[PDB]
Amino acid sequence: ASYKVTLKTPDGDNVITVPDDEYILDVAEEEGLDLPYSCRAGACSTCAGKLVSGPAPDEDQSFLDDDQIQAGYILTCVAYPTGDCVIETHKEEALY
Ligand code: FES
Numbered sequence: 001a002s003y004k005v006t007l008k009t010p011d012g013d014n015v016i017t018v019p020d021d022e023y024i025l026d027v028a029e030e031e032g033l034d035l036p037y038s039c040r041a042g043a044c045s046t047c048a049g050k051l052v053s054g055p056a057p058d059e060d061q062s063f064l065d066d067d068q069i070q071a072g073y074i075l076t077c078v079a080y081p082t083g084d085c086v087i088e089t090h091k092e093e094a095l096y
Contacts, residue, residue: 006086008052009033024049024057024079024087035076035089042078045092049074054085066095 005024006015018027025035025047037047042062051057051072059069062078073095074087 003054003081004084005054005081006052007033007035007049007089008086009035009089018081020080020082022080023077024081025076028076028089037077040077042075045075045095047076048091048095049076049079050088050091050094052086052088054087055082057081057085068095 002017002019004015004017006013007028014031014033016027016031018024025037028035035047038044042065044065051074056069057074058080059074059078062075065075073091076089
């Protein structure tokens with residue numbers, strides 16, 4: 001219902017709180033932050049995150065995007081937080 005997620009972005013460690021029915025960037029943006037994205041669809045790599053800590057955000061959404069959620073690589077434009085969490089957020093320079 002409202003997991004405290006921390007994003008370790010360029011500039012600092014900001015901590016948002018996102019409801020479980022809200023994509024992590026939907027929130028992130030409303031707060032007034034960036035993460036780079038394209039498609040808004042999980043169609044690509046641009047808004048790629050890395051889970052530091054936490055569960056795993058239900059990413060049963062954004063997929064055709066190379067089967068490595070597992071690496072901790074999560075796609076922020078189509079992510080549902082499942083609990084409390086920390087995530088690195090500028091992350092295509094891993095994926096390639
Ligand atoms: S912006 Fe394309 S997958 Fe997230």
